[PDB]
């Protein structure tokens, strides 16, 4: 009956996530190549801006879907734009057609910026709109049907990301870039075809109107006021609740900065470490580290929720949401410290010994030290993620009315994107000639350890301020 | 982020 509609949503989400993670994983290696004479800092900033845009356009995508247009039509248009970007990327990667784009230190900046902008907007709208759509397609049956559907959605997202980070990343790093970038385009084309042909069997609703319009109208009109202006008391109470919720995300911003460093600068460091070779010369993909962290997250969340939580509740001593957020930020602190220590050790070691390794088309003068010592940073990032990202939304939901979902998620994604933008801005600020931290794709002449220590220090200041505020709050 | 798969249906105890 409804399996023709739920399956289409599941498949579309799987293909979309596979394409997105295929693009994001090997973008730093792609830009730091032959067609583009981009440095490490510039490529890291570009990928950080791309991720920040993808996560910051989500509230605007939701407002576009709800206030006007529609939900299904918004997903369709976003998939069209995202496929346009997925056609822009391989046409640029192929040597033959790159001449038509940019034949005559950013060789093809306009094309690689237009493609990134279009992909970011499409991904933002699809990510903001697909989950309410999937919930709507099954909400009629009952809570248990929605629970089963969202178990399937959880697994679909995980397998999409894992299959991407394994296969597409391996192909892009070792086999070629044209095929490894056409595969996500084929995935997006299949997703678009599935959604277009599956549109007739979908259950759609007219545009209702998100709470963002009421938020902005109240803010422009304006403790606020009750039953004095046109707005009702319930809307004012909801806006006050959201204002009370915002500071948690405002404090979580540096957390998301350090998190989104995961596959921007940690990947660069991994490229500049000694990556093992797994074939007679196919090196290990640099995205397999974040794939391993994702596998750890999948293996641990059921483990956590089924072992730690039940006995913790039975024996007491359970921590509140804010304590879990603080623990997550402390683990982020430790991850940044570990990254700084590793980078300092690598920079001290490379002063005399360096081995030339090739990863794709470009040759990296890596150090002797092995890649596997970077595992603690990724493990700490994953543990901090499970401790903090979930607890933040749990607290926000516990402090918001039950009628305001998809607005908590919108603000959460918006502040995550703001954190990514802040990280990119900090990298650019330390990239100036006044400081000269990264004013030397080789980062051996740069100072990445100082940048990692700065991230750790700002995270520490934020954590101490958060704890001092939370003592009074609790 | 890698946790958004779990965060998508958090209210349903995903
Ligand atoms: C690294 O590559 C450069 C350019 O090919 C070369 O001059 C240098 O000898 C290489 N170093 C090592 C250690 O292979």
Author numbering:
A (entry chain A): 32 to 135, 150 to 267, 299 to 356, 361 to 520, 525 to 558
B (entry chain B): 1 to 14
Please quote the paper that reports this structure:
TASL, a recently identified innate immune adaptor protein for endolysosomal TLR7/8/9 signaling, is recruited by the lysosomal proton-coupled amino-acid transporter SLC15A4, and then activates IRF5, which in turn triggers the transcription of type I interferons and cytokines. Solute carrier family 15 member 4 (SLC15A4, also known as PHT1) is one of four members of the SLC15 family, which belongs to the proton-coupled amino-acid/oligopeptide transporter (POT) family and the major facilitator superfamily (MFS). The architecture of SLC15A4 lacks a bulky soluble domain and the TM domain contains 12 TMs that mimic the canonical major facilitator superfamily (MFS) fold, with TM1 to TM6 forming the N-terminal bundle and TM7 to TM12 forming the C-terminal bundle. Here, we report three cryo-electron microscopy (cryo-EM) structures of human SLC15A4 in the apo monomeric and dimeric state and as a TASL-bound complex.
Notably, the co-expression of the C-terminal strep-tagged TASL(1–20)-EGFP and C-terminal Flag-tagged SLC15A4 gave rise to a clearly observed EGFP signal that served as a rigid body to facilitate 3D alignment. Finally, we resolved SLC15A4/TASL(1–20)-EGFP complex at an overall resolution of 3.03 Å, which was of sufficient quality to allow confident modeling of the SLC15A4 and the N-terminal region of TASL. The human SLC15A4/TASL complex occupies a volume of 60 × 55 × 45 Å3, with a stoichiometry of 1:1 for SLC15A4 and TASL. A solvent-accessible vestibule, formed mainly by TM1, TM2, TM8, and TM10 of SLC15A4, extends from the intracellular, cytosolic region into the TMD. At the deep end of this vestibule, the binding pocket of SLC15A4 is negatively charged. The N-terminal helix (residues 1–14) of TASL protrudes into the binding pocket of SLC15A4 by approximately 25 Å and entertains a number of interactions, enabling it to form a stable TASL-SLC15A4 module. The amine nitrogen atoms of the main chains of TASLL2/S3 were coordinated by SLC15A4E465 via hydrogen bonds, while the side chains of TASLE4 interacted with SLC15A4R48/Y86. Similarly, the side chain of TASLTyr6 was coordinated by the side chains of SLC15A4K384/D385. During TASL binding, helices 1, 4 and 5 from the N-bundle and helices 10 and 11 from the C-bundle move in opposite directions to enlarge the cytosol cleft to further accommodate the binding of TASL.
